[PDB]
Amino acid sequence: EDHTLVLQLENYQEVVSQLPSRDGHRLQVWKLDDSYSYDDRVQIVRDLHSWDENKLSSFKKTSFEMTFLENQIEVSHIPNGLYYVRSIIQTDAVSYPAEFLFEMTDQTVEPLVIVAKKTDTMTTKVKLIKVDQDHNRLEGVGFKLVSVARDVSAAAVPLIGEYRYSSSGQVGRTLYTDKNGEIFVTNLPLGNYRFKEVEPLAGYAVTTLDTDVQLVDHQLVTITVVNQKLPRGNVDFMKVDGRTNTSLQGAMFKVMKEESGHYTPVLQNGKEVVVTSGKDGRFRVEGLEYGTYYLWELQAPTGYVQLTSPVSFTIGKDELVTVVKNNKRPR
Numbered sequence: 001e002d003h004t005l006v007l008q009l010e011n012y013q014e015v016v017s018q019l020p021s022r023d024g025h026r027l028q029v030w031k032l033d034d035s036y037s038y039d040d041r042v043q044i045v046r047d048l049h050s051w052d053e054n055k056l057s058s059f060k061k062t063s064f065e066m067t068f069l070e071n072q073i074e075v076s077h078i079p080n081g082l083y084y085v086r087s088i089i090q091t092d093a094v095s096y097p098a099e100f101l102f103e104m105t106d107q108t109v110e111p112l113v114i115v116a117k118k119t120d121t122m123t124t125k126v127k128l129i130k131v132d133q134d135h136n137r138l139e140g141v142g143f144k145l146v147s148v149a150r151d152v153s154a155a156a157v158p159l160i161g162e163y164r165y166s167s168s169g170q171v172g173r174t175l176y177t178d179k180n181g182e183i184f185v186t187n188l189p190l191g192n193y194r195f196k197e198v199e200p201l202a203g204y205a206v207t208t209l210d211t212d213v214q215l216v217d218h219q220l221v222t223i224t225v226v227n228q229k230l231p232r233g234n235v236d237f238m239k240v241d242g243r244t245n246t247s248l249q250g251a252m253f254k255v256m257k258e259e260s261g262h263y264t265p266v267l268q269n270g271k272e273v274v275v276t277s278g279k280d281g282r283f284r285v286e287g288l289e290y291g292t293y294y295l296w297e298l299q300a301p302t303g304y305v306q307l308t309s310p311v312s313f314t315i316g317k318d319e320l321v322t323v324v325k326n327n328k329r330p331r
Contacts (some may be wrong), residue, residue: 001157003104004111005075010118018094018168022068027075029060029083038103049149068127080104088264093168128183137181142174142199148192204229211223230289233315242325247281252299290315
């Protein structure tokens with residue numbers, strides 16, 4: 001009449017981590033009548049599998065206190081009997097369904113140890129495939145996943161591991177393509193989702209920021225997102241006095257792109273790109289993807305006025321050296 005049952009679970013540490021409280025849980029059981037034998041456990045468990053209250057109506061429904069210890073659960077103060085379990089844990093965050101029988105007799109060595117197999121394992125599944133325009137797979141591209149309600153990005157989706165929904169998971173994560181270009185997410189609730197390409201790989205331009213996906217059942221949904229690999233080019237500059245066309249040393253610029261109304265620094269060789277007109281007026285930007293850029297003037301040549309706006313330039317397939325003119329400060 002005072003037995004303890006020890007339950008070991010799949011992915012035990014992580015499941016526990018997802019529990020609000022390790023304390024106050026109960027194990028729901030049915031205590032079987034004497035027409036049932038533990039010798040018949042395979043067939044019993046099969047015969048009770050398809051839920052029907054008419055299969056259970058003769059049994060005594062009860063429950064026992066559980067505790068989640070470090071690597072296993074203990075279930076406390078269990079009388080002698082033959083007991084059926086359908087669920088070990090069932091919460092808003094975590095479900096651990098499990099169908100088995102256990103038997104306590106006066107001969108039972110304490111504790112009884114059962115390694116419980118998780119049941120009800122089908123899950124939603126979505127696979128994102130990231131490619132370039134020739135369908136090479138792209139590794140290391142970052143996405144965030146958001147759910148969608150009536151077209152709006154309703155929430156950042158919580159996740160654990162790599163990558164599985166959990167309603168008590170972390171909402172702040174960027175998901176990154178693997179060596180096969182793939183992101184794989186399981187157990188998302190049914191519904192409408194959007195993968196947002198928040199972190200493109202340099203050299204590959206975003207075609208569509210958002211890629212929508214709808215999970216209506218448990219069948220794999222695969223979506224393919226296409227990036228534009230951009231060629232690279234160079235530009236030679238020469239800083240001169242605009243009246244005399246003689247070269248000027250010491251004009252400093254930061255190279256920038258524009259994004260959403262502000263200038264942001266171009267990064268190359270592990271830093272922001274700064275260029276300085278040389279003894280001959282010359283400077284240069286090399287490599288650097290096709291697109292539109294700006295020379296943001298940090299410092300004018302001695303004796304010269306600051307340019308009134310940054311110098312725009314476009315790198316593209318289409319002068320041998322681009323001349324940048326400076327006006328001598330009258331004063």
